[PDB]
Amino acid sequence: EYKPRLLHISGDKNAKVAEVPLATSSLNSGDCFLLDAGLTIYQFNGSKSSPQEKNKAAEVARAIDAERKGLPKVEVFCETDSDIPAEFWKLLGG
């Protein structure tokens, strides 16, 4: 099947970000997250925490931005409510 990627951007006051395997349930709503799917990519940023993961994340998305040359499509949002749109959760969870 396609090659999905689960990146995580968060760490309460001790922010930390790094690669991660699939995880729809073990996800982390509230901090900024990034899933990579073939050409599309959803930075499911989480509003319960904006500055830590927004910095560490914007850092990660920037590097991926220069690596793929923007060829792929991205979707970024650090939201909490409605944080589970069947489309993204169907992608990595379904």
Swiss-Prot record:
Superkingdom, natural source: Eukaryota
Gelsolin-like repeat extents: 15-55
Disulphide-bridged cysteine pairs: none
Record-listed a 1,2-diacyl-sn-glycero-3-phospho-(1D-myo-inositol-4,5-bisphosphate) binding positions: 5-13
MF annotations from Gene Ontology: actin filament binding; actin filament severing activity; actin monomer binding; calcium ion binding; calcium-dependent protein binding; phosphatidylinositol-4,5-bisphosphate binding
GO cellular component, one term: cytoplasm
Function according to Swiss-Prot or TrEMBL: Severin blocks the ends of F-actin and causes the fragmentation and depolymerization of actin filaments in a Ca(2+) dependent manner.
Additional observations: Severin changes its conformation upon binding of Ca(2+) and then interacts with F-actin.
UniProt name for this protein: Severin
Organism listed in the record: Dictyostelium discoideum
Taxon lineage: Eukaryota, Amoebozoa, Evosea, Eumycetozoa, Dictyostelia
Stretch of the intact protein here: 158 to 251 of 362
